[PDB]
PDB file of C-alpha atoms and ligand atoms in Angstrom:
ATOM      1  CA  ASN P   1     -36.985 -58.875  22.677  1.00  0.00           C
ATOM      2  CA  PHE P   2     -36.459 -58.161  18.941  1.00  0.00           C
ATOM      3  CA  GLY P   3     -36.439 -60.691  15.858  1.00  0.00           C
ATOM      4  CA  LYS P   4     -32.730 -60.945  15.734  1.00  0.00           C
ATOM      5  CA  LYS P   5     -30.257 -60.672  18.147  1.00  0.00           C
ATOM      6  CA  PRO P   6     -27.862 -57.233  18.299  1.00  0.00           C
ATOM      7  CA  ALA P   7     -25.124 -56.692  16.383  1.00  0.00           C
ATOM      8  CA  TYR P   8     -22.900 -55.445  19.780  1.00  0.00           C
ATOM      9  CA  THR P   9     -23.956 -55.130  23.419  1.00  0.00           C
ATOM     10  CA  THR P  10     -22.735 -52.434  26.339  1.00  0.00           C
ATOM     11  CA  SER P  11     -23.297 -52.233  29.906  1.00  0.00           C
ATOM     12  CA  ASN P  12     -26.375 -50.228  29.014  1.00  0.00           C
ATOM     13  CA  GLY P  13     -27.648 -50.814  25.837  1.00  0.00           C
ATOM     14  CA  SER P  14     -27.459 -52.950  22.119  1.00  0.00           C
ATOM     15  CA  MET P  15     -27.556 -52.195  18.673  1.00  0.00           C
ATOM     16  CA  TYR P  16     -29.159 -53.431  15.789  1.00  0.00           C
ATOM     17  CA  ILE P  17     -28.723 -54.412  11.827  1.00  0.00           C
ATOM     18  CA  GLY P  18     -32.117 -53.884  10.288  1.00  0.00           C
ATOM     19  CA  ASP P  19     -35.558 -52.153   9.376  1.00  0.00           C
ATOM     20  CA  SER P  20     -36.456 -50.016  12.193  1.00  0.00           C
ATOM     21  CA  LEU P  21     -40.109 -49.700  11.258  1.00  0.00           C
ATOM     22  CA  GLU P  22     -39.655 -53.847  11.524  1.00  0.00           C
ATOM     23  CA  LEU P  23     -37.927 -53.718  14.904  1.00  0.00           C
ATOM     24  CA  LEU P  24     -40.044 -50.700  16.575  1.00  0.00           C
ATOM     25  CA  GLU P  25     -42.948 -53.568  16.693  1.00  0.00           C
ATOM     26  CA  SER P  26     -40.758 -55.509  19.225  1.00  0.00           C
ATOM     27  CA  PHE P  27     -41.544 -53.080  22.206  1.00  0.00           C
ATOM     28  CA  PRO P  28     -43.904 -53.198  24.387  1.00  0.00           C
ATOM     29  CA  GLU P  29     -46.241 -50.054  24.311  1.00  0.00           C
ATOM     30  CA  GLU P  30     -45.619 -46.595  26.438  1.00  0.00           C
ATOM     31  CA  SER P  31     -41.849 -48.188  27.202  1.00  0.00           C
ATOM     32  CA  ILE P  32     -39.606 -45.857  25.478  1.00  0.00           C
ATOM     33  CA  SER P  33     -39.507 -42.276  27.343  1.00  0.00           C
ATOM     34  CA  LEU P  34     -37.585 -40.746  23.964  1.00  0.00           C
ATOM     35  CA  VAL P  35     -37.043 -41.259  20.695  1.00  0.00           C
ATOM     36  CA  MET P  36     -33.874 -39.149  19.157  1.00  0.00           C
ATOM     37  CA  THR P  37     -32.934 -39.179  15.763  1.00  0.00           C
ATOM     38  CA  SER P  38     -31.940 -37.813  12.364  1.00  0.00           C
ATOM     39  CA  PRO P  39     -33.547 -39.246   9.492  1.00  0.00           C
ATOM     40  CA  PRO P  40     -31.834 -40.405   6.118  1.00  0.00           C
ATOM     41  CA  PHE P  41     -32.169 -37.523   3.499  1.00  0.00           C
ATOM     42  CA  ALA P  42     -31.674 -38.052  -0.254  1.00  0.00           C
ATOM     43  CA  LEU P  43     -34.091 -37.119  -2.722  1.00  0.00           C
ATOM     44  CA  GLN P  44     -37.427 -38.805  -0.797  1.00  0.00           C
ATOM     45  CA  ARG P  45     -37.096 -42.154  -0.016  1.00  0.00           C
ATOM     46  CA  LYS P  46     -38.969 -45.857  -0.117  1.00  0.00           C
ATOM     47  CA  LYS P  47     -41.679 -45.280  -1.785  1.00  0.00           C
ATOM     48  CA  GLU P  48     -42.808 -45.606  -5.941  1.00  0.00           C
ATOM     49  CA  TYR P  49     -43.664 -43.331  -8.042  1.00  0.00           C
ATOM     50  CA  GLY P  50     -41.342 -40.348  -7.825  1.00  0.00           C
ATOM     51  CA  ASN P  51     -44.572 -38.095  -7.816  1.00  0.00           C
ATOM     52  CA  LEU P  52     -43.628 -34.687  -5.683  1.00  0.00           C
ATOM     53  CA  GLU P  53     -40.109 -36.346  -3.625  1.00  0.00           C
ATOM     54  CA  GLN P  54     -41.277 -33.892  -0.822  1.00  0.00           C
ATOM     55  CA  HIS P  55     -44.947 -36.220  -0.555  1.00  0.00           C
ATOM     56  CA  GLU P  56     -43.478 -39.347  -0.904  1.00  0.00           C
ATOM     57  CA  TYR P  57     -40.599 -38.869   1.713  1.00  0.00           C
ATOM     58  CA  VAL P  58     -42.989 -37.331   4.120  1.00  0.00           C
ATOM     59  CA  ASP P  59     -45.286 -40.498   3.669  1.00  0.00           C
ATOM     60  CA  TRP P  60     -42.559 -43.058   4.135  1.00  0.00           C
ATOM     61  CA  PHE P  61     -41.482 -41.481   7.297  1.00  0.00           C
ATOM     62  CA  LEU P  62     -44.563 -41.249   8.945  1.00  0.00           C
ATOM     63  CA  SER P  63     -45.131 -44.700   9.611  1.00  0.00           C
ATOM     64  CA  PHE P  64     -42.141 -44.278  11.429  1.00  0.00           C
ATOM     65  CA  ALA P  65     -44.183 -41.436  13.340  1.00  0.00           C
ATOM     66  CA  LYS P  66     -47.284 -43.865  13.842  1.00  0.00           C
ATOM     67  CA  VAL P  67     -45.459 -46.787  15.361  1.00  0.00           C
ATOM     68  CA  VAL P  68     -43.156 -44.412  17.837  1.00  0.00           C
ATOM     69  CA  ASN P  69     -46.390 -42.776  18.590  1.00  0.00           C
ATOM     70  CA  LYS P  70     -47.968 -46.504  20.283  1.00  0.00           C
ATOM     71  CA  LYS P  71     -44.349 -46.991  22.064  1.00  0.00           C
ATOM     72  CA  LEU P  72     -43.847 -43.778  23.530  1.00  0.00           C
ATOM     73  CA  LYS P  73     -44.985 -43.580  26.696  1.00  0.00           C
ATOM     74  CA  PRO P  74     -47.601 -40.722  27.753  1.00  0.00           C
ATOM     75  CA  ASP P  75     -44.769 -38.185  29.130  1.00  0.00           C
ATOM     76  CA  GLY P  76     -42.064 -39.531  25.989  1.00  0.00           C
ATOM     77  CA  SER P  77     -40.871 -37.435  23.497  1.00  0.00           C
ATOM     78  CA  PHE P  78     -39.982 -37.913  19.619  1.00  0.00           C
ATOM     79  CA  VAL P  79     -37.029 -34.844  18.962  1.00  0.00           C
ATOM     80  CA  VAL P  80     -36.246 -35.231  14.708  1.00  0.00           C
ATOM     81  CA  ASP P  81     -33.425 -33.824  13.568  1.00  0.00           C
ATOM     82  CA  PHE P  82     -34.063 -32.445  10.155  1.00  0.00           C
ATOM     83  CA  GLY P  83     -31.409 -30.511   7.742  1.00  0.00           C
ATOM     84  CA  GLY P  84     -32.837 -27.875   4.946  1.00  0.00           C
ATOM     85  CA  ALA P  85     -33.052 -29.174   1.688  1.00  0.00           C
ATOM     86  CA  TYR P  86     -33.024 -27.275  -2.316  1.00  0.00           C
ATOM     87  CA  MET P  87     -34.664 -28.750  -4.990  1.00  0.00           C
ATOM     88  CA  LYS P  88     -33.104 -30.375  -8.109  1.00  0.00           C
ATOM     89  CA  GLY P  89     -31.356 -27.573 -10.247  1.00  0.00           C
ATOM     90  CA  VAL P  90     -33.004 -24.539  -8.744  1.00  0.00           C
ATOM     91  CA  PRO P  91     -32.513 -22.127  -5.728  1.00  0.00           C
ATOM     92  CA  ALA P  92     -36.312 -22.789  -4.437  1.00  0.00           C
ATOM     93  CA  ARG P  93     -36.093 -24.497  -0.889  1.00  0.00           C
ATOM     94  CA  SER P  94     -37.620 -28.135  -0.343  1.00  0.00           C
ATOM     95  CA  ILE P  95     -40.438 -27.688   2.269  1.00  0.00           C
ATOM     96  CA  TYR P  96     -39.989 -31.305   3.415  1.00  0.00           C
ATOM     97  CA  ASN P  97     -39.486 -30.670   6.288  1.00  0.00           C
ATOM     98  CA  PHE P  98     -41.876 -28.270   7.526  1.00  0.00           C
ATOM     99  CA  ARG P  99     -44.989 -30.696   5.491  1.00  0.00           C
ATOM    100  CA  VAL P 100     -43.387 -33.602   7.961  1.00  0.00           C
ATOM    101  CA  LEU P 101     -44.630 -31.268  10.780  1.00  0.00           C
ATOM    102  CA  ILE P 102     -48.249 -30.189  10.113  1.00  0.00           C
ATOM    103  CA  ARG P 103     -48.767 -33.938   8.924  1.00  0.00           C
ATOM    104  CA  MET P 104     -47.685 -35.147  12.128  1.00  0.00           C
ATOM    105  CA  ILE P 105     -49.649 -33.238  14.425  1.00  0.00           C
ATOM    106  CA  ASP P 106     -52.719 -33.145  12.085  1.00  0.00           C
ATOM    107  CA  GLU P 107     -53.074 -36.735  10.607  1.00  0.00           C
ATOM    108  CA  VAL P 108     -50.417 -38.991  13.230  1.00  0.00           C
ATOM    109  CA  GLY P 109     -51.836 -36.826  16.837  1.00  0.00           C
ATOM    110  CA  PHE P 110     -48.782 -35.493  18.106  1.00  0.00           C
ATOM    111  CA  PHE P 111     -47.849 -32.160  19.933  1.00  0.00           C
ATOM    112  CA  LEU P 112     -45.093 -29.455  19.029  1.00  0.00           C
ATOM    113  CA  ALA P 113     -43.858 -29.337  22.602  1.00  0.00           C
ATOM    114  CA  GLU P 114     -40.982 -27.160  21.569  1.00  0.00           C
ATOM    115  CA  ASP P 115     -39.370 -26.061  17.964  1.00  0.00           C
ATOM    116  CA  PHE P 116     -35.609 -26.334  18.482  1.00  0.00           C
ATOM    117  CA  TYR P 117     -32.966 -24.619  16.011  1.00  0.00           C
ATOM    118  CA  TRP P 118     -29.525 -25.860  15.140  1.00  0.00           C
ATOM    119  CA  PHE P 119     -27.117 -23.210  13.743  1.00  0.00           C
ATOM    120  CA  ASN P 120     -23.984 -25.960  12.902  1.00  0.00           C
ATOM    121  CA  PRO P 121     -21.500 -23.227  11.936  1.00  0.00           C
ATOM    122  CA  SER P 122     -19.171 -25.132  10.374  1.00  0.00           C
ATOM    123  CA  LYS P 123     -21.568 -27.138   7.396  1.00  0.00           C
ATOM    124  CA  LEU P 124     -20.106 -28.157   4.101  1.00  0.00           C
ATOM    125  CA  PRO P 125     -23.332 -29.073   2.496  1.00  0.00           C
ATOM    126  CA  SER P 126     -23.641 -25.077   2.013  1.00  0.00           C
ATOM    127  CA  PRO P 127     -24.629 -25.429  -1.893  1.00  0.00           C
ATOM    128  CA  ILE P 128     -21.711 -24.220  -4.204  1.00  0.00           C
ATOM    129  CA  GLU P 129     -24.064 -23.113  -6.695  1.00  0.00           C
ATOM    130  CA  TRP P 130     -25.819 -20.638  -5.110  1.00  0.00           C
ATOM    131  CA  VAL P 131     -23.771 -19.880  -2.518  1.00  0.00           C
ATOM    132  CA  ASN P 132     -20.017 -19.046  -3.286  1.00  0.00           C
ATOM    133  CA  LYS P 133     -20.439 -18.665  -7.077  1.00  0.00           C
ATOM    134  CA  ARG P 134     -23.495 -17.794  -8.403  1.00  0.00           C
ATOM    135  CA  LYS P 135     -23.616 -15.023  -4.751  1.00  0.00           C
ATOM    136  CA  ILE P 136     -27.369 -15.815  -4.417  1.00  0.00           C
ATOM    137  CA  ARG P 137     -28.414 -17.243  -1.112  1.00  0.00           C
ATOM    138  CA  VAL P 138     -26.887 -17.342   2.288  1.00  0.00           C
ATOM    139  CA  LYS P 139     -24.470 -20.098   4.575  1.00  0.00           C
ATOM    140  CA  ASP P 140     -27.371 -22.789   4.684  1.00  0.00           C
ATOM    141  CA  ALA P 141     -26.615 -23.489   8.472  1.00  0.00           C
ATOM    142  CA  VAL P 142     -29.553 -24.012  10.828  1.00  0.00           C
ATOM    143  CA  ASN P 143     -31.529 -27.187  10.879  1.00  0.00           C
ATOM    144  CA  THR P 144     -35.416 -27.674  11.774  1.00  0.00           C
ATOM    145  CA  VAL P 145     -34.887 -30.200  15.096  1.00  0.00           C
ATOM    146  CA  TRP P 146     -38.744 -30.712  15.905  1.00  0.00           C
ATOM    147  CA  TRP P 147     -39.619 -32.024  19.830  1.00  0.00           C
ATOM    148  CA  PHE P 148     -42.689 -33.948  18.916  1.00  0.00           C
ATOM    149  CA  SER P 149     -44.443 -35.325  22.262  1.00  0.00           C
ATOM    150  CA  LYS P 150     -47.252 -37.620  22.670  1.00  0.00           C
ATOM    151  CA  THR P 151     -48.916 -35.401  25.327  1.00  0.00           C
ATOM    152  CA  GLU P 152     -49.155 -31.205  26.187  1.00  0.00           C
ATOM    153  CA  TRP P 153     -47.151 -32.635  29.008  1.00  0.00           C
ATOM    154  CA  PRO P 154     -43.719 -34.503  28.476  1.00  0.00           C
ATOM    155  CA  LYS P 155     -41.801 -34.775  31.187  1.00  0.00           C
ATOM    156  CA  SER P 156     -39.223 -32.105  30.492  1.00  0.00           C
ATOM    157  CA  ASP P 157     -36.615 -30.366  32.985  1.00  0.00           C
ATOM    158  CA  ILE P 158     -34.763 -27.681  31.944  1.00  0.00           C
ATOM    159  CA  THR P 159     -32.117 -26.677  34.925  1.00  0.00           C
ATOM    160  CA  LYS P 160     -30.298 -30.124  33.843  1.00  0.00           C
ATOM    161  CA  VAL P 161     -29.828 -28.263  30.923  1.00  0.00           C
ATOM    162  CA  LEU P 162     -29.327 -24.907  32.684  1.00  0.00           C
ATOM    163  CA  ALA P 163     -26.389 -22.041  30.838  1.00  0.00           C
ATOM    164  CA  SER P 164     -28.643 -19.150  33.101  1.00  0.00           C
ATOM    165  CA  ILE P 165     -31.833 -20.513  30.857  1.00  0.00           C
ATOM    166  CA  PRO P 166     -30.855 -21.141  27.742  1.00  0.00           C
ATOM    167  CA  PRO P 167     -32.806 -20.617  24.345  1.00  0.00           C
ATOM    168  CA  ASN P 168     -34.784 -22.025  21.564  1.00  0.00           C
ATOM    169  CA  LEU P 169     -30.960 -22.194  19.595  1.00  0.00           C
ATOM    170  CA  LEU P 170     -28.528 -24.411  20.351  1.00  0.00           C
ATOM    171  CA  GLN P 171     -25.208 -23.557  19.175  1.00  0.00           C
ATOM    172  CA  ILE P 172     -22.594 -26.572  18.107  1.00  0.00           C
ATOM    173  CA  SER P 173     -20.565 -27.762  15.796  1.00  0.00           C
ATOM    174  CA  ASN P 174     -19.789 -31.586  14.626  1.00  0.00           C
ATOM    175  CA  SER P 175     -16.269 -31.692  15.177  1.00  0.00           C
ATOM    176  CA  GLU P 176     -15.261 -30.681  18.615  1.00  0.00           C
ATOM    177  CA  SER P 177     -13.561 -33.902  19.090  1.00  0.00           C
ATOM    178  CA  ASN P 178     -11.101 -36.119  17.682  1.00  0.00           C
ATOM    179  CA  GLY P 179     -11.382 -39.738  19.322  1.00  0.00           C
ATOM    180  CA  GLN P 180     -10.755 -43.046  18.808  1.00  0.00           C
ATOM    181  CA  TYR P 181     -13.681 -43.700  16.409  1.00  0.00           C
ATOM    182  CA  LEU P 182     -12.109 -41.868  13.493  1.00  0.00           C
ATOM    183  CA  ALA P 183      -8.741 -43.146  13.993  1.00  0.00           C
ATOM    184  CA  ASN P 184     -10.203 -46.564  14.444  1.00  0.00           C
ATOM    185  CA  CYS P 185     -12.199 -45.582  10.858  1.00  0.00           C
ATOM    186  CA  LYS P 186      -8.489 -44.377   8.852  1.00  0.00           C
ATOM    187  CA  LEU P 187      -7.430 -47.877  10.323  1.00  0.00           C
ATOM    188  CA  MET P 188      -9.741 -49.997   8.455  1.00  0.00           C
ATOM    189  CA  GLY P 189      -9.378 -48.235   5.421  1.00  0.00           C
ATOM    190  CA  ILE P 190     -12.896 -46.500   5.880  1.00  0.00           C
ATOM    191  CA  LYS P 191     -14.438 -43.952   5.601  1.00  0.00           C
ATOM    192  CA  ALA P 192     -16.602 -42.306   9.462  1.00  0.00           C
ATOM    193  CA  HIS P 193     -20.532 -41.833   8.997  1.00  0.00           C
ATOM    194  CA  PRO P 194     -20.979 -39.276   5.749  1.00  0.00           C
ATOM    195  CA  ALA P 195     -23.357 -37.472   7.911  1.00  0.00           C
ATOM    196  CA  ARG P 196     -23.522 -37.568  12.032  1.00  0.00           C
ATOM    197  CA  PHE P 197     -24.225 -35.141  14.307  1.00  0.00           C
ATOM    198  CA  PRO P 198     -22.158 -33.477  17.228  1.00  0.00           C
ATOM    199  CA  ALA P 199     -22.521 -35.415  20.564  1.00  0.00           C
ATOM    200  CA  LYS P 200     -23.992 -32.373  22.216  1.00  0.00           C
ATOM    201  CA  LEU P 201     -27.629 -32.391  20.276  1.00  0.00           C
ATOM    202  CA  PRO P 202     -28.424 -35.391  21.995  1.00  0.00           C
ATOM    203  CA  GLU P 203     -26.710 -34.706  25.271  1.00  0.00           C
ATOM    204  CA  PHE P 204     -29.038 -31.668  25.066  1.00  0.00           C
ATOM    205  CA  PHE P 205     -32.689 -33.609  24.987  1.00  0.00           C
ATOM    206  CA  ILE P 206     -30.886 -36.900  26.903  1.00  0.00           C
ATOM    207  CA  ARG P 207     -30.812 -34.665  30.405  1.00  0.00           C
ATOM    208  CA  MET P 208     -33.481 -32.783  29.826  1.00  0.00           C
ATOM    209  CA  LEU P 209     -36.139 -35.204  28.990  1.00  0.00           C
ATOM    210  CA  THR P 210     -35.041 -38.376  30.659  1.00  0.00           C
ATOM    211  CA  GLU P 211     -33.794 -39.438  33.448  1.00  0.00           C
ATOM    212  CA  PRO P 212     -30.968 -41.818  34.672  1.00  0.00           C
ATOM    213  CA  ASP P 213     -31.591 -45.569  33.624  1.00  0.00           C
ATOM    214  CA  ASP P 214     -34.878 -44.520  30.537  1.00  0.00           C
ATOM    215  CA  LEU P 215     -34.900 -46.253  27.519  1.00  0.00           C
ATOM    216  CA  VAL P 216     -32.920 -43.814  25.058  1.00  0.00           C
ATOM    217  CA  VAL P 217     -34.123 -45.128  21.210  1.00  0.00           C
ATOM    218  CA  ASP P 218     -32.729 -44.084  18.020  1.00  0.00           C
ATOM    219  CA  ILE P 219     -33.965 -45.239  14.906  1.00  0.00           C
ATOM    220  CA  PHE P 220     -31.310 -44.609  12.257  1.00  0.00           C
ATOM    221  CA  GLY P 221     -28.617 -44.843  14.188  1.00  0.00           C
ATOM    222  CA  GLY P 222     -25.584 -44.405  11.688  1.00  0.00           C
ATOM    223  CA  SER P 223     -22.346 -43.737  14.127  1.00  0.00           C
ATOM    224  CA  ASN P 224     -24.642 -44.414  17.254  1.00  0.00           C
ATOM    225  CA  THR P 225     -23.949 -40.967  19.024  1.00  0.00           C
ATOM    226  CA  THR P 226     -27.007 -41.464  20.447  1.00  0.00           C
ATOM    227  CA  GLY P 227     -26.341 -44.724  22.178  1.00  0.00           C
ATOM    228  CA  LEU P 228     -22.891 -43.135  23.102  1.00  0.00           C
ATOM    229  CA  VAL P 229     -23.932 -40.331  24.801  1.00  0.00           C
ATOM    230  CA  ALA P 230     -27.034 -42.204  26.456  1.00  0.00           C
ATOM    231  CA  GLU P 231     -24.363 -44.838  27.471  1.00  0.00           C
ATOM    232  CA  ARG P 232     -22.114 -42.118  29.233  1.00  0.00           C
ATOM    233  CA  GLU P 233     -25.278 -40.309  30.830  1.00  0.00           C
ATOM    234  CA  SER P 234     -26.244 -43.121  32.704  1.00  0.00           C
ATOM    235  CA  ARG P 235     -29.460 -43.855  30.505  1.00  0.00           C
ATOM    236  CA  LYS P 236     -30.455 -47.065  29.093  1.00  0.00           C
ATOM    237  CA  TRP P 237     -30.676 -47.302  24.947  1.00  0.00           C
ATOM    238  CA  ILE P 238     -31.225 -49.469  21.660  1.00  0.00           C
ATOM    239  CA  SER P 239     -30.491 -48.375  17.747  1.00  0.00           C
ATOM    240  CA  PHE P 240     -31.435 -49.851  14.730  1.00  0.00           C
ATOM    241  CA  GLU P 241     -29.054 -49.260  11.820  1.00  0.00           C
ATOM    242  CA  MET P 242     -29.623 -50.615   8.129  1.00  0.00           C
ATOM    243  CA  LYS P 243     -26.305 -50.151   7.092  1.00  0.00           C
ATOM    244  CA  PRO P 244     -23.805 -53.402   8.614  1.00  0.00           C
ATOM    245  CA  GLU P 245     -20.524 -50.946   7.906  1.00  0.00           C
ATOM    246  CA  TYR P 246     -21.938 -47.934   9.687  1.00  0.00           C
ATOM    247  CA  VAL P 247     -23.044 -50.044  13.207  1.00  0.00           C
ATOM    248  CA  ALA P 248     -19.568 -52.092  13.084  1.00  0.00           C
ATOM    249  CA  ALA P 249     -17.428 -48.989  12.705  1.00  0.00           C
ATOM    250  CA  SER P 250     -20.382 -47.492  15.244  1.00  0.00           C
ATOM    251  CA  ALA P 251     -19.046 -50.638  17.842  1.00  0.00           C
ATOM    252  CA  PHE P 252     -15.495 -48.392  18.305  1.00  0.00           C
ATOM    253  CA  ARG P 253     -16.997 -45.742  20.046  1.00  0.00           C
ATOM    254  CA  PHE P 254     -17.056 -48.117  22.285  1.00  0.00           C
ATOM    255  CA  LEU P 255     -13.503 -49.171  23.761  1.00  0.00           C
ATOM    256  CA  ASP P 256      -9.774 -47.457  24.543  1.00  0.00           C
ATOM    257  CA  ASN P 257      -7.405 -46.424  23.336  1.00  0.00           C
ATOM    258  CA  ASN P 258      -5.589 -50.130  24.657  1.00  0.00           C
ATOM    259  CA  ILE P 259      -6.668 -52.271  22.162  1.00  0.00           C
ATOM    260  CA  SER P 260      -4.714 -53.697  19.428  1.00  0.00           C
ATOM    261  CA  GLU P 261      -5.384 -53.512  15.840  1.00  0.00           C
ATOM    262  CA  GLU P 262      -5.629 -56.692  15.175  1.00  0.00           C
ATOM    263  CA  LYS P 263      -8.457 -56.464  17.994  1.00  0.00           C
ATOM    264  CA  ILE P 264      -9.794 -53.868  16.373  1.00  0.00           C
ATOM    265  CA  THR P 265     -10.294 -55.287  12.741  1.00  0.00           C
ATOM    266  CA  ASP P 266     -11.447 -58.714  14.355  1.00  0.00           C
ATOM    267  CA  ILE P 267     -14.466 -56.370  15.981  1.00  0.00           C
ATOM    268  CA  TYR P 268     -15.194 -55.138  13.136  1.00  0.00           C
ATOM    269  CA  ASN P 269     -15.282 -57.841  10.836  1.00  0.00           C
ATOM    270  CA  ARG P 270     -17.081 -60.116  13.087  1.00  0.00           C
ATOM    271  CA  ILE P 271     -20.212 -57.790  13.662  1.00  0.00           C
ATOM    272  CA  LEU P 272     -19.829 -57.272   9.258  1.00  0.00           C
ATOM    273  CA  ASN P 273     -20.254 -61.029   9.422  1.00  0.00           C
ATOM    274  CA  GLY P 274     -23.499 -61.476  11.543  1.00  0.00           C
ATOM    275  CA  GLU P 275     -22.271 -61.819  14.679  1.00  0.00           C
ATOM    276  CA  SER P 276     -23.279 -60.982  18.650  1.00  0.00           C
ATOM    277  CA  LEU P 277     -20.274 -59.282  20.580  1.00  0.00           C
ATOM    278  CA  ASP P 278     -20.891 -58.620  23.819  1.00  0.00           C
ATOM    279  CA  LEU P 279     -18.427 -56.059  23.924  1.00  0.00           C
ATOM    280  CA  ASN P 280     -18.858 -55.594  27.796  1.00  0.00           C
ATOM    281  CA  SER P 281     -16.025 -57.349  28.486  1.00  0.00           C
ATOM    282  CA  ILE P 282     -13.387 -58.203  25.410  1.00  0.00           C
TER     283      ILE P 282
HETATM  284  N1  SAH I 301     -35.683 -48.186   7.612  1.00  0.00           N
HETATM  285  C1  SAH I 301     -34.189 -47.812   8.108  1.00  0.00           C
HETATM  286  N2  SAH I 301     -34.401 -48.614   9.156  1.00  0.00           N
HETATM  287  C2  SAH I 301     -32.820 -48.192   9.916  1.00  0.00           C
HETATM  288  N3  SAH I 301     -31.957 -47.619   9.588  1.00  0.00           N
HETATM  289  C3  SAH I 301     -31.849 -46.999   8.362  1.00  0.00           C
HETATM  290  C4  SAH I 301     -33.270 -46.796   7.787  1.00  0.00           C
HETATM  291  N4  SAH I 301     -33.036 -46.260   6.385  1.00  0.00           N
HETATM  292  C5  SAH I 301     -31.733 -45.530   6.410  1.00  0.00           C
HETATM  293  N5  SAH I 301     -30.966 -45.755   7.703  1.00  0.00           N
HETATM  294  C6  SAH I 301     -29.940 -45.047   8.326  1.00  0.00           C
HETATM  295  O1  SAH I 301     -30.445 -43.915   8.849  1.00  0.00           O
HETATM  296  C7  SAH I 301     -28.723 -42.996   9.343  1.00  0.00           C
HETATM  297  C8  SAH I 301     -29.299 -41.888   8.891  1.00  0.00           C
HETATM  298  S1  SAH I 301     -28.233 -40.370   9.652  1.00  0.00           S
HETATM  299  C9  SAH I 301     -28.146 -41.290  11.648  1.00  0.00           C
HETATM  300  C10 SAH I 301     -26.608 -40.206  11.557  1.00  0.00           C
HETATM  301  C11 SAH I 301     -26.818 -40.232  13.124  1.00  0.00           C
HETATM  302  N6  SAH I 301     -27.681 -39.429  14.629  1.00  0.00           N
HETATM  303  C12 SAH I 301     -25.055 -40.561  13.869  1.00  0.00           C
HETATM  304  O2  SAH I 301     -24.453 -39.283  14.602  1.00  0.00           O
HETATM  305  O3  SAH I 301     -24.339 -41.151  13.394  1.00  0.00           O
HETATM  306  C13 SAH I 301     -28.218 -43.416   8.074  1.00  0.00           C
HETATM  307  O4  SAH I 301     -26.836 -44.349   8.354  1.00  0.00           O
HETATM  308  C14 SAH I 301     -29.237 -44.756   7.416  1.00  0.00           C
HETATM  309  O5  SAH I 301     -27.830 -45.559   6.675  1.00  0.00           O
END
């Protein structure tokens, strides 16, 4: 359906290498039930000038927001994970994650179904200069996860997420796992994705807003935790990621301990070489 061939494919889905703002267009319209991601944030993003990173970043991301509006079903949701950030050499917060919010409702026309908040106890990006050293700010440990929806009535059922009705606050930490992806990464002498989220994050939203066989898309795949979860929960998925290293290593997530190291490198390099692996069988 897309203008390319997936890096790899499994039982319920397939991951592509490429720019998601292009690939999204290949989806029919009102076809996606849940788009779940956490955008790449480093000093702005693709947009010339350098006017106020806050604004440049916002415009960049709003582009994806626009196309995602079209492709989401009327009962569809667009959950977005954002991490706080200070500005260069000053202990004043950037409010880029909040600017996205306002312009998404005002300009794009989304609705904030509900604002969620993720507390990750163990978080290293905590800026030592302001916290540990100067002792002027506290551990930056809460991420603004915005659950957006195409209409005021997106598909949702909190009983599949029952704790006892749970709250607005999700307390999860990145590693409550060991897994073969970390091991297989170590094998290739490569580093695991620099910034990936715990499986429980997308699990919560996959279970709550979608039913089995629903299409869960992730426009900034990374290590593909989403597709992984969407797989073991029996939803259909599709992920887009720009970097081949990330896609290649992510494939490991869909294998077992019982695989020759010689076969792992083959899978890694073949994907890194542009081949289309059908992981469903060898
Ligand atoms: N325009 C683009 N299209 C597709 N992927 C993109 C992109 N711009 C940035 N990316 C990818 O966006 C990812 C953001 S981090 C993704 C982490 C993911 N949730 C997981 O747990 O790993 C980064 O890997 C970045 O390389």
